[PDB]
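Quick entry between incubations.
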Amino acid sequence: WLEGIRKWYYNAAGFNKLGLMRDDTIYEDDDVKEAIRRLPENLYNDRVFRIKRALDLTMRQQILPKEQWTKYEEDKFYLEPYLKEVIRERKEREEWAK
Amino acid sequence: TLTARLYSLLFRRTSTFALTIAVGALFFERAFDQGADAIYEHINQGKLWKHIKHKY
Amino acid sequence: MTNIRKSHPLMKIINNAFIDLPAPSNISSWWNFGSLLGICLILQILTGLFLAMHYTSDTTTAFSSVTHICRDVNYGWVIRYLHANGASMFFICLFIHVGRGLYYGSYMFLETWNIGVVLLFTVMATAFMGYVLPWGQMSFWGATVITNLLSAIPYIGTDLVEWIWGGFSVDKATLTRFFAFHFILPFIITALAAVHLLFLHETGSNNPTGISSDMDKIPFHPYYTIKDILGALFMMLILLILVLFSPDLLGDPDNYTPANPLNTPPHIKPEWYFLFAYAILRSIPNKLGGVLALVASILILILMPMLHTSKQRSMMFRPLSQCLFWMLVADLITLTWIGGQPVEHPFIIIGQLASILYFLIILVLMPITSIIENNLLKW
Amino acid sequence: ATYAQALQSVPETQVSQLDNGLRVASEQSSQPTCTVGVWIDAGSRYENEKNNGAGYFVEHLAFKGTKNRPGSALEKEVESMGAHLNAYSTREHTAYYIKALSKDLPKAVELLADIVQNCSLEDSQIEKERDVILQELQENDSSMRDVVFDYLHATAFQGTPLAQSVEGPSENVRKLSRADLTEYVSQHYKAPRMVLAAAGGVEHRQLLDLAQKHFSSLSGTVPAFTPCRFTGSEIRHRDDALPLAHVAIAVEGPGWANPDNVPLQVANAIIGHYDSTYGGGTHMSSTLASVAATRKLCQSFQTFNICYAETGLLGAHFVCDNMSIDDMMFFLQGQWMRLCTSATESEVVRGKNILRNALVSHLDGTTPVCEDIGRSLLTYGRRIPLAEWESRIAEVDASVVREVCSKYFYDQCPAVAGLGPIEQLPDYNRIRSGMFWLRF
Amino acid sequence: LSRFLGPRYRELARNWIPTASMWGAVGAVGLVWATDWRLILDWVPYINGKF
Amino acid sequence: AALPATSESPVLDAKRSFLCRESLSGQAAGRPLVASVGLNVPASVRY
Amino acid sequence: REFGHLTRMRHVITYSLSPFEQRAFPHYFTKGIPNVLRRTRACILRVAPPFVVFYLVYTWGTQEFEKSKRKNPA
Ligand code: HEM
Ligand code: HEM
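Done. Structure below.
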């Protein structure tokens, strides 16, 4: 099934090895730059520590032990609602500009 | 006044200013080149290789 | 009352650029090449000056001057071969730098990327004129071919070619103007590299992961400065091996024959670092089409920030795209080899496919693939 | 009720004229209240440099007392009947309106007939009011907005009676004598230059009878101003103790009638007004307002269209800190040239609606309606009905605005008046250069 | 992109077309003048005397 | 609406000098304060 | 851009040791060799295939060329 290939790509991506749940690997554009800002405090702090861990590991060229690899089924999308809201607001702004 | 109509027609918009600069340069080049060449020809009349070439 | 490092107006920029510059903590070795370029340029400036110390850019004495450098002047051979192999190594690091920029998503930095493209153009032009200077058979004939390529431009083709030549053919005037242009251009490269660094410093740097490292920055001085020195030492190792154990390994021996405008050499292959475009130039049957393809091969780097569509900045987490990028690198190597080879049955078609696939990866395959994993990762 | 029907269903401003030349006007609609005023055609515009400030002095002395109503008795009449008496004197107009109940409209008219015709001008009262004028001028010194606007009028219309302030120089205030005030009230309060306007529940026939029974014995049936000149200049009062720096920039506007007023009021409406205590902030369609709220470089800015008879001032006044004046000038000029060169339809529609709402909402209550009547009968020569205003707004489009702003804004020498920490304010050369766009 | 086109941008274009087009005319005149394009100056009255 | 009220209010700013008995006239409130801020209309008070 | 206007971060504790008490080469080979083997395993299947197909293309071209340069029955 399609979930098979989704899981295969998730495992092959490698950000699960570093402990990152998808949203931590986002390219920070303007909309994203606002999306992090709108995040609540707890989620923001967790994300920043998680990225700190990844940067440390990449500097050391190491990965987490197999156990603490964020599962595909446990990858929470904490940024998708905020980012989607920012995108919708930007689309509405552009439409009003038209 | 002439200058007022001139300004209104072709000096207000900077695009007209640039076009006027271009065409004025194009015509002024001919005017100045002809004038300076005539002046030099007149003051050194009979000396350059233009009063004498027909003699050979 | 205040630290001179952060008080002296001149020391301000140096401290903010190399001492207290916040740099990403997880920067890999692929970024060390950024220093390796600049340092290398200085050698090209340092050596290239001393070649200019003993050099008469004249058709009847340029080759004699080069031989006198390599044979009579005290350790002149050291300077000459250091300079040539340093130019080749400079292009090696330039290609690796562009590859790093493509991989870890550095072309998001826009202004630095375009300035780097201009740097690339200027460096290739400089290397072309430099290879013209020795006035060997390959020097003269490659210069003739490459400048004749400009005749493909419509209308203004012949007049432009004769303008660049400084006459009717590559001769006294061409060499004399090429030497002065080769003198001036590296200083333009230096100023433009300063502009490159100025633009880069405002956006920090792109770590291999691609996520912002604004919260893991480290001081520059005790760190990479030493790592940059280590990289420079490795670069010196490679360069010194090349100079001291096989100076003419990367160079056609035919250049050592004095340039005779009566005998076409069996092969007119340019330096190793240009064939990748030269092969493309050979691929397109149309002359104007060939020149446009040749220039567009380098210009395609400018379009890269536009073509990127994957929501991840870096290539660290995009496997299929990584396979595509390594296919691109293999294509570049294939193009170099094809440019090395003559224009015969087995090589023409290979060059055609190599050029087509090299363009196809950058324009179509990479963005279309970037769509694919975005759909795969539920976004 | 389709809006246009409502404008068509507005009671007409009935206007008549007495033999003396009194323009009597009324707008009886429904209310049991009224505002009755006599809008003089006097002011600091009709004053020589010796007489500067005489209009203000006459305005102050008007309500004190009359021969028929000695002193406080006048006040006793106004307060005991519930009426609110008030006056206002700008550079070209002067009015004394007594808001009152519609039932006691007769007495008020009589009261007004006392104030404007039969004044007192008591010498002791003259000195007592001289001191008050001096202290009130020292008060107005603190008013940054008023001071900056007077600076603008001085630097723009230099060498002309428009430059003269309403209050007059402090020297004159002491040097005015009762003879000058009597001459001013006997030379600039003549019957032809009078407008008796009443709003609220005031039947026109009753108003005419009252005017003929009270204002009859007036002047029978020359000082008529001089066309002033615009002089692109600036006054910079660098004073680095004031917290904020008030700047006002203006260009020669239209005349009072000058139909170009209608498009320009739309164009200024596009710029709009912003300050720190507003709502939406970084959402207003006004680019200046949005940028100001995004960077907080503005404390309070607005667009003014002070328009006199032969000329007028059209521009903007902004209040900001010391380090944001240049950014202000840049954005303000940039928006001006943007409207000048490419105005587009949407913001023109927004400006049309904004102007419609301004004119409609302003004309509520007896005092604003009466003020409109009195001012219209003097400036335009007629009370322009709201239906006509709607008609004049309707045909204004993007091209019309783009052309009128081109004829008023593009490449025009401005007049600048800065006060406070105005060092950051660009010199006149950069400001003048802002009014032309090389990209155009 | 989709951010372009639409109502507002087309009248913006209509407003700026005369200026941009005649700036291009400025550029054409400047180019022919600087480069002395014989082809074009063949068809101007005064400047035929050059050649 | 189109009207910016009248008193454009600067914070970090001083008031208008009131050194007259007449100027003073009226300052004394008679009715309770009522704050009124608004979109498109500046905030003011009334006493 | 200098240190201080970089980010906001909270509840992150960072320890460290001076370079003068920690060995600069802590079990260099013992942990390095498995690390390098793992890194090579991660990327070999995605790095090598294009290079080996390039090698095949190059060798194939070499012979095909020199066969084209060979003789022919006639
Ligand atoms: C951008 C950096 C530079 C590059 C890439 C470069 C490249 C080259 C190359 C490839 C050659 C041909 C060498 C040969 O065939 O033997 C050359 C020659 C030469 N270069 Fe440079 N060069 C650079 C900088 C300079 C500078 C700054 C100078 C002058 C100070 C200079 C002076 C010369 C001279 C005189 C020659 C002729 C002698 C020779 O053939 O080596 N070069 N250059
Ligand atoms: C004259 C030769 C060049 C020099 C001296 C030079 C110098 C530098 C230096 C020192 C860095 C910082 C170190 C690094 O990040 O690698 C850098 C970064 C960069 N350069 Fe260059 N560069 C040159 C050519 C180029 C070229 C050809 C490009 C591509 C068109 C380019 C684009 C970039 C980019 C995108 C970065 C940011 C990399 C990152 O931080 O992730 N540069 N350059």
